[PDB]
Amino acid sequence: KRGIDLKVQPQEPLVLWRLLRGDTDVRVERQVELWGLKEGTYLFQLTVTANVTVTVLSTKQTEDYCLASNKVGRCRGSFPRWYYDPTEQICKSFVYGGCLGNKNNYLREEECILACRGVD
Ligand SMILES: [K+]
Incomplete structure (x- = not known):
């Protein structure tokens, strides 16, 4: 693996x-x-x-992994991914283009939850 x-x-x-x-x-x-x-x-x-x-994560990195906007990126693919919405303090799904996104982008909801549960 x-x-x-x-x-x-x-x-x-x-x-x-x-x-x-x-x-x-x-x-x-x-x-x-x-x-x-x-x-x-x-x-x-x-x-x-x-x-x-x-x-x-440090608080500084937490800005990147949790506080950043979701980012589809430049490619036209369709990957179901997760990002943290700090305003509502919950992990939401979004469709990712497959390249050149940002760090607020998790393959699994559980991973998003681990990265950002409790962040505002
Ligand atoms: K999942």
Whole structure:
């Protein structure tokens, strides 16, 4: 499986395994619960193999991942995607053109929720 990179708001238990690289000492407890994550990046190997990285967003990056307008972009494709609407504080679906969009653009609603739940 190709790696995943999850952007998330800091949250002491992150609800979704072995840590390969983290700025801090995470603890993973089995859904799973990630404890101790701080602003920054973490890399895990998942086996029953795959890469999972978790980027705990800064407020500055949160502007890009949550506060930016949805962006169809220049291409004429049709990709169902998700963006966060901070005005209404909810994840909405939109059709993405497939290129040159911005960071407020998630493949899965759950990923949008993780990236932006609680942002205004
Ligand atoms: K989805």
